[PDB]
Amino acid sequence: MSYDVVIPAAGQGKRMKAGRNKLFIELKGDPVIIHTLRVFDSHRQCDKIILVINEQEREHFQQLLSDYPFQTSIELVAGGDERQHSVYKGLKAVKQEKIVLVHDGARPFIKHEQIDELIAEAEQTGAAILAVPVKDTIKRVQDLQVSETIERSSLWAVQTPQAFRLSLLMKAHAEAERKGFLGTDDASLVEQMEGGSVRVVEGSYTNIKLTTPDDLTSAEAIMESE
Amino acid sequence: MSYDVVIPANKLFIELKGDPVIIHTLRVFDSHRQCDKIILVINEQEREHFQQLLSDYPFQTSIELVAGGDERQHSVYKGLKAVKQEKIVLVHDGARPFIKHEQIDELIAEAEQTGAAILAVPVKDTIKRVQDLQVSETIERSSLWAVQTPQAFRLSLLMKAHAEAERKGFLGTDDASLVEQMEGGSVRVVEGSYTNIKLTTPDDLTSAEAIMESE
Ligand SMILES: Nc1ccn([C@@H]2O[C@H](COP(=O)(O)OP(=O)(O)OP(=O)(O)O)[C@@H](O)[C@H]2O)c(=O)n1
Ligand SMILES: [Mg+2]
């Protein structure tokens, strides 16, 4: 029942345009990454947190973490140039075979309820993601000019966490690294493997990712609402 | 220079800070000098409910209620028959109240220059096709855009588009699809704003309230 969580936090936050890691931005007085860490530190089934960071920020994370009452162990692991590389470095720090969750540092509003439903699906079938139905029309665009329209009734917008049996995720990462496949999520690595299957748990539209400046306004309102 | 806007219709009476979302949306087109007419397409049996709304919220810009078919595509078509001469027509979701005139002008500017346009933003999330709560494929993310409204077209061009799409069986999801599908159909894309959100659910209202107070 017990899991480890790998939290990629090693990005620069270029689209957020804060002039520093977006994850140090304060929401209601506490950095984004502190909100995210708190969800896992307060969740009884989380044994360990592996937080993947840019090595230049390590002393800053050391300080930052010492100011807060985290009781669960938090290991700082250096990341890489892309999220996938960062995730793989974090996963190599997990010590025993078990269920592992990978969760973006930039999603601070994940709830214990959804974490619970994912771990259950991963335990049964191996690989589970949070997701929500797409509501907008999606099209592909070449040089600000439409090339085609994707059918939407079956389309879903994927969230984190994504939950996996460690062995299965490590195998997906190792194959992807050897072949040069760079996926945008951990699920797509598993999908690329022969016989790879991923299941969907419906998530909350409040589990937003903080990516652009307008996402900070949505974030403040979600906080105030709860 | 000047456009009509067709708005196809109830969820639109959901409120945002005291007023139905449709009234916030109407205000934007009413405050825009290049908007000559607003055509609001409705179910014929709700004509009184709408008359009442428009009585309570007087607008200076001309607003015409028109009877609407059983689907958005048919409603938009019915709406377009109420446009009286050749010009740019917008088609806009009533539940998108935060459209800015700046974006509206770019949409027109492009659809006069080249015939058809849409507002859109880059997709931020990974998108998967899912069948029975099991992933079937991941859609390649890189050149993906989330489409908003309004969508702006030369009337002849779009009514032409509705004409041929009527002639085949083709039911569309939005209207830009009708342009892209027949002929050598070209739709340019104007990068919109992530604030141009659609309001249906109560989580949506939570965001909308925040956007309003922010600006
Ligand atoms: N090389 C990277 C890039 C991203 N991430 C992390 O992966 C999560 C999702 O990535 P994204 O939202 O793109 O964050 P950034 O890459 O930092 O932002 P941008 O793409 O706008 O630079 C973030 O918590 C980010 O810190 C990471 O650990 N290593
Ligand atoms: Mg990134």
Residue numbers in the entry:
A (entry chain A): 1 to 226
B (entry chain B): 1 to 9, 21 to 226
Original authors' sentences:
The third enzyme is 2-C-Methyl-d-erythritol-4-phosphate cytidyltransferase (IspD), 4-diphosphocytidyl-2-C-methyl-d-erythritol (CDPME) is formed from MEP by reaction with CTP12. The subunit structure of BsIspD was of a compact α/β fold from which a long β-meander extended. The core of the enzyme consisted of a seven β-sheets (β2, β1, β4, β9, β5, β8, β10) where all strands were parallel, apart from β8 and β2. The β-meander lay between antiparallel strands β6 and β7 and made the major contribution to the dimer interface, and the lesser contribution came from the side-chain interactions of the residues on the α-helix fragment at the C-terminus.
